[PDB]
Scaffold this active site. Structure first.
Site, PDB file in Angstrom:
ATOM      1  N   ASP A 190      -6.876  -1.343 -10.597  1.00 29.92           N
ATOM      2  CA  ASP A 190      -6.542  -2.184  -9.444  1.00 29.92           C
ATOM      3  C   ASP A 190      -7.785  -2.237  -8.543  1.00 29.92           C
ATOM      4  O   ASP A 190      -7.721  -2.030  -7.323  1.00 29.92           O
ATOM      5  CB  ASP A 190      -5.352  -1.628  -8.697  1.00 29.92           C
ATOM      6  CG  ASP A 190      -4.699  -2.636  -7.804  1.00 29.92           C
ATOM      7  OD1 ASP A 190      -5.058  -3.856  -7.853  1.00 29.92           O
ATOM      8  OD2 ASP A 190      -3.826  -2.232  -7.030  1.00 29.92           O
ATOM      9  N   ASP A 209      -6.371   4.619  -4.403  1.00 27.66           N
ATOM     10  CA  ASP A 209      -5.253   3.946  -5.062  1.00 27.66           C
ATOM     11  C   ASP A 209      -5.487   3.781  -6.558  1.00 27.66           C
ATOM     12  O   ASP A 209      -5.748   2.697  -7.007  1.00 27.66           O
ATOM     13  CB  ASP A 209      -4.949   2.596  -4.441  1.00 27.66           C
ATOM     14  CG  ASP A 209      -3.625   2.028  -4.926  1.00 27.66           C
ATOM     15  OD1 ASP A 209      -2.982   2.693  -5.792  1.00 27.66           O
ATOM     16  OD2 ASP A 209      -3.197   0.948  -4.391  1.00 27.66           O
TER      17      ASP A 209
HETATM   18  N1  GNP Z   1      -9.185   5.241   5.109  1.00 21.49           N
HETATM   19  C1  GNP Z   1      -8.279   5.509   4.153  1.00 21.49           C
HETATM   20  N2  GNP Z   1      -7.198   4.726   4.012  1.00 21.49           N
HETATM   21  C2  GNP Z   1      -6.352   5.010   3.036  1.00 21.49           C
HETATM   22  C3  GNP Z   1      -6.550   6.128   2.165  1.00 21.49           C
HETATM   23  N3  GNP Z   1      -5.492   6.250   1.290  1.00 21.49           N
HETATM   24  C4  GNP Z   1      -4.686   5.167   1.628  1.00 21.49           C
HETATM   25  N4  GNP Z   1      -5.233   4.463   2.671  1.00 21.49           N
HETATM   26  C5  GNP Z   1      -4.649   3.295   3.351  1.00 21.49           C
HETATM   27  O1  GNP Z   1      -3.261   3.252   2.964  1.00 21.49           O
HETATM   28  C6  GNP Z   1      -3.005   2.025   2.235  1.00 21.49           C
HETATM   29  C7  GNP Z   1      -2.023   2.260   1.127  1.00 21.49           C
HETATM   30  O2  GNP Z   1      -2.640   3.116   0.198  1.00 21.49           O
HETATM   31  P1  GNP Z   1      -2.520   2.708  -1.370  1.00 21.49           P
HETATM   32  O3  GNP Z   1      -2.845   3.922  -2.207  1.00 21.49           O
HETATM   33  O4  GNP Z   1      -3.439   1.535  -1.603  1.00 21.49           O
HETATM   34  O5  GNP Z   1      -0.934   2.384  -1.457  1.00 21.49           O
HETATM   35  P2  GNP Z   1      -0.113   1.521  -2.566  1.00 21.49           P
HETATM   36  O6  GNP Z   1       1.264   1.839  -2.615  1.00 21.49           O
HETATM   37  O7  GNP Z   1      -0.646   1.983  -4.022  1.00 21.49           O
HETATM   38  N5  GNP Z   1      -0.407  -0.093  -2.167  1.00 21.49           N
HETATM   39  P3  GNP Z   1      -0.969  -1.165  -3.422  1.00 21.49           P
HETATM   40  O8  GNP Z   1      -0.667  -0.545  -4.921  1.00 21.49           O
HETATM   41  O9  GNP Z   1      -0.110  -2.388  -3.283  1.00 21.49           O
HETATM   42  O10 GNP Z   1      -2.540  -1.335  -3.103  1.00 21.49           O
HETATM   43  C8  GNP Z   1      -4.376   1.492   1.774  1.00 21.49           C
HETATM   44  O11 GNP Z   1      -4.384   0.061   1.703  1.00 21.49           O
HETATM   45  C9  GNP Z   1      -5.219   1.958   2.957  1.00 21.49           C
HETATM   46  O12 GNP Z   1      -5.000   1.099   4.063  1.00 21.49           O
HETATM   47  C10 GNP Z   1      -7.698   6.930   2.419  1.00 21.49           C
HETATM   48  O13 GNP Z   1      -7.934   7.936   1.704  1.00 21.49           O
HETATM   49  N6  GNP Z   1      -8.525   6.525   3.343  1.00 21.49           N
HETATM   50 MG    MG Z   2      -1.582   1.181  -5.525  1.00 22.50          MG
END
Ligand code: GNP
Ligand code: MG
Ligand code: CL
Length: 294
Positions: A190, A209
């Site tokens: 992704d 992610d």
């Molecule tokens: N700065 C920062 N933001 C983070 C971190 N982990 C998550 N985020 C924030 O939290 C959001 C959601 O995290 P994510 O792992 O992408 O969640 P998800 O359920 O897998 N969303 P998707 O699969 O639709 O991208 C990210 O878009 C980001 O805004 C991190 O380690 N650092």
């Molecule tokens: Mg994700």
């Protein structure tokens, strides 16, 4: 909203014995899952679901053990995984998410160093011996075939001729393509610029992610880097990264991206069928008409 945070504060404190939540806010949110920033320091991803976080956790662990890189990735300190609820907690990686606007303010040399950093990261990850996570395989072609069968068993017969033709024309292309026959490796899967973090010198400092990661076609990690849209930087960015990465057929990478893009409305319909969400079925079908008339 303030209620949502309370439930989750409660759950975090209930499942993780000595964890004290002094602050908690929503930082991200889809239709499956919600992410929270806790004590201004920890990310907690949570999902009310096998469709949970066991694989994602296994992948973080494997990567933290085997990658040699300065680029940070989540390092799971807290986890709870059950059939109905999954939670992963890790220290927040600090930085600024890459965007097209930001990239456009960077100098030529900054842009190059960013591209090189991405290419290097992808080369190292794709080169890992994945034996120790060998159960995390993903076969996109076979998945699509199974999704098509599910369509045939549920709503296919109620679709219009235009919708059916879009789908059959995609299935025909899938059957003729060779882009699933190349190198398989561990991919992020992704890999879009909203998952890439920059430090204060505009260098790549972290990647988040890995929730869809697995062992899959090498071409998978270039799909968003090659995308031309408002959210991504552009096809040239992806092309340059591919040249830096080396030893990969760029025209196949682009064909792989184009095929995944053509699939998107069908993926949407199938999501709605599987999750009993009519809104997604309708959106996917409408999107087929939008694409047919462009
Ligand atoms: N700065 C920062 N933001 C983070 C971190 N982990 C998550 N985020 C924030 O939290 C959001 C959601 O995290 P994510 O792992 O992408 O969640 P998800 O359920 O897998 N969303 P998707 O699969 O639709 O991208 C990210 O878009 C980001 O805004 C991190 O380690 N650092
Ligand atoms: Mg994700
Ligand atoms: Cl519908």
């Amino acid at each position: 909203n303030a209620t949502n945070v309370k439930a989750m504060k409660y759950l975090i404190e209930h499942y993780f014995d000595n964890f004290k939540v002094d602050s908690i806010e929503i930082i991200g949110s889809g239709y499956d899952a919600v992410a929270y920033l806790v004590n201004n320091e920890y990310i907690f991803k949570t999902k009310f679901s096998k469709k949970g976080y066991a694989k994602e956790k296994a992948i973080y662990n494997f990567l933290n053990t085997n990658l040699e890189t300065n680029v940070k990735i989540p390092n799971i300190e807290y986890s709870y995984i059950s059939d109905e609820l999954s939670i992963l907690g890790y220290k927040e990686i600090k930085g600024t998410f890459l965007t097209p606007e930001i990239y456009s303010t960077m100098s030529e040399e900054e842009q190059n160093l960013l591209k090189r950093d991405i290419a290097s990261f992808l080369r190292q990850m794709h080169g890992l011996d994945y034996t120790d996570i060998s159960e995390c395989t993903i076969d996109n072609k076979q998945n699509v075939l199974e999704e098509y069968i599910l369509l045939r068993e549920t709503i296919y017969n109620d679709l219009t001729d235009i919708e059916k033709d879009y789908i059959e024309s995609f299935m025909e292309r899938l059957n003729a393509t060779t882009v699933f026959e190349g190198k398989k490796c561990l991919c992020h899967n992704d890999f879009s610029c909203n998952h890439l973090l920059l430090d204060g010198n505009n260098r790549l400092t972290g990647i988040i992610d890995f929730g869809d990661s697995g062992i899959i076609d090498e071409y998978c990690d270039f799909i968003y880097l090659l995308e031309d849209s408002e959210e991504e930087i552009g096809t040239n960015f992806g092309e340059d990264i591919l040249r830096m990465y080396g030893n990969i057929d760029i025209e196949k990478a682009k064909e792989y991206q184009d095929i995944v893009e053509e699939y998107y409305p069908i993926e949407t319909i199938v999501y709605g069928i599987k999750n009993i969400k009519q809104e997604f079925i309708e959106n996917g079908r409408k999107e087929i008409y939008k694409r047919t008339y462009k």
